[PDB]
Amino acid sequence: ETLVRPKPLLLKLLKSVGAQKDTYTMKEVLFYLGQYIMTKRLYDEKQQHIVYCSNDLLGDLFGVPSFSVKEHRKIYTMIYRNLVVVN
Ligand SMILES: [Cl-]
Ligand SMILES: [Cl-]
Ligand SMILES: [Cl-]
Ligand SMILES: [Cl-]
Ligand SMILES: [Cl-]
Ligand SMILES: [Cl-]
Ligand SMILES: [Cl-]
Numbered sequence: 001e002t003l004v005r006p007k008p009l010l011l012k013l014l015k016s017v018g019a020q021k022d023t024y025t026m027k028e029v030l031f032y033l034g035q036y037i038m039t040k041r042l043y044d045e046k047q048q049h050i051v052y053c054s055n056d057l058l059g060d061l062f063g064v065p066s067f068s069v070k071e072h073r074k075i076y077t078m079i080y081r082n083l084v085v086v087n
Pocket of ligand 3: 012013016057
C-alpha cells in the first residue's frame with residue numbers, strides 16, 4: 001500500500017464524492033477519482049476510455065483538457081502532483 005495525503009484541491013474533490021479521511025491509500029484515491037468522473041459524467045459516452053475535463057476542477061488538477069484512461073503512467077504523474085506520500 002501507498003499512503004498519501006491529498007493536497008487541498010484534490011481533497012475537496014474527494015470529499016465531494018463522499019471521502020471522509022485526511023490520508024488515503026492510492027487505491028482509495030483512484031476509487032474516488034473514478035466515482036467523481038462517473039457522477040459528473042466527464043467520460044465520453046461514445047468512447048469511455050476518453051475523459052473530458054477542460055471545464056472542470058479535474059482539468060485544473062491534472063493540467064490537461066482531456067486524457068485517455070490508457071495513459072496509465074501519465075495519469076499517475078498527474079495524480080501524484082496533487083498529493084504527498086507519507087509512511
Ligand atoms: Cl495503495
Ligand atoms: Cl491544491
Ligand atoms: Cl467540487
Ligand atoms: Cl474515505
Ligand atoms: Cl476503482
Ligand atoms: Cl502508460
Ligand atoms: Cl511525494
